[PDB]
Design a protein around this ligand. Structure first.
Ligand SMILES: Cc1cc2nc[nH]c2cc1C
Ligand SMILES: O=C(O)CNC(=O)C(=O)O
Ligand code: NI
Ligand SMILES: [Zn+2]
Length: 327
């Protein structure tokens, strides 16, 4: 078996290898990349997402989210308080203000220490889940707005035709902005391109060990666990690497820099934080190997977790018992 220790692998495709997206994902998996739950892909040196990021300041963040923490430094939840709309230019200015800017630090490790020590005492503002794309329409390779759709994957594999669409989201971050422990909707893959700005640090649990994270989460957030059989779907729970280590949970970490892709694999729990002002674009996707994970995906039915229009069809076809129980 390839990659038995479930290490995060880093790939450097040539421009020739960067032409066929599906083929390269399959190649990464042939090398065991999926066992980690997360992989980094550094694009060919000749490749660009777009010519410049010069004129993005007029993008609107209709509903910026203030991420307010509760708990202790290594075990906390966050809720999102909606704020008034602001442009990306205004958001960038806010991110660089004295109140919100990245503190002095020695290196990524020092900054990581500061994040876990001090995160809960601040409430950074995140621009999340903004439908759109910053890929130039003429970018032919790894254009996250031009991927084959999950609906077409399901149709090719299973012969069922379903409603629904599949488009990218933009994420504008600042220092300490946080993404909670989660797998993707329907335990899909995701791909994430860091367009510009400061780095993003990721933590990930190997898919084969996901239940270990679930069990720890039930112990650490016992009320939440009683309220919902899949409360990590709510995307509000954080657990630090120190607490994971103390509880013997297998995980890895890596920092993504501007110009790099990350892929998360089916049922790879991940969490992380932004180092400073940045912009990422992400979208879910599927492969034939995903289908069995989609069938097994745990669902929130307490009502807290958002179920998109397109998710409906996934549940209806892959999980008809769970769907009927909904209805
Ligand atoms: C181990 C395991 C547990 C799961 N629970 C939901 N999907 C799953 C997929 C795997 C692989
Ligand atoms: O970047 C973020 O804020 C969170 N992104 C993801 O969880 C992802 O791409 O799968
Ligand atoms: Ni994700
Ligand atoms: Zn729930």
């Amino acid at each position: 078996a390839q990659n038995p220790n479930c290490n995060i692998m880093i790939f450097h495709p040539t421009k020739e290898e960067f032409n066929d997206f599906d083929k390269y994902i399959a190649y990464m998996e042939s090398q065991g990349a999926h066992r980690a739950g997360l992989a980094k892909i550094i694009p060919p040196k000749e490749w660009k997402a777009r010519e410049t990021y010069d004129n993005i300041s007029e993008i609107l963040i209709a509903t910026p989210l203030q991420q307010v923490a509760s708990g202790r430094a290594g075990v906390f939840t966050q809720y999102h308080k909606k704020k008034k709309a602001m442009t990306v230019g205004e958001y960038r200015h806010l991110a660089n203000s004295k109140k919100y800017q990245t503190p002095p630090h020695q290196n990524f490790e020092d900054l990581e220490r500061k994040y876990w020590k001090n995160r809960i005492y601040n409430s950074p503002i995140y621009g999340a889940d903004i439908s759109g794309s910053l890929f130039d329409e003429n970018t032919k390779q790894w254009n996250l707005g031009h991927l084959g759709t999950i609906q077409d994957l399901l149709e090719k594999e299973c012969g069922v035709v379903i409603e629904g669409v599949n488009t990218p989201y933009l994420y504008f971050g600042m220092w300490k902005t946080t993404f909670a422990w989660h797998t993707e909707d329907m335990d899909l893959y995701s791909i994430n391109y860091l367009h510009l700005g400061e780095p993003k640090t990721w933590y990930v649990v190997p898919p084969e060990h996901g239940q270990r994270l679930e069990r720890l989460a039930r112990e650490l957030f016992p009320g939440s666990s009683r309220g919902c059989g899949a409360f990590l779907r709510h995307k509000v729970a954080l657990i630090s690497p120190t607490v994971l280590k103390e509880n013997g949970i297998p995980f890895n970490r890596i920092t993504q820099e501007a110009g790099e892709f990350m892929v998360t694999f089916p049922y790879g729990y991940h969490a992380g934080f932004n180092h400073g002002f940045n912009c990422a674009e992400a979208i879910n996707f599927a492969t034939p190997r995903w289908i069995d994970y989609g069938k097994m995906a745990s669902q929130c039915s307490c009502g807290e977790a958002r179920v998109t229009f397109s998710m409906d069809a996934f549940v209806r076809i892959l999980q008809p018992e769970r769907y009927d129980l909904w209805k």
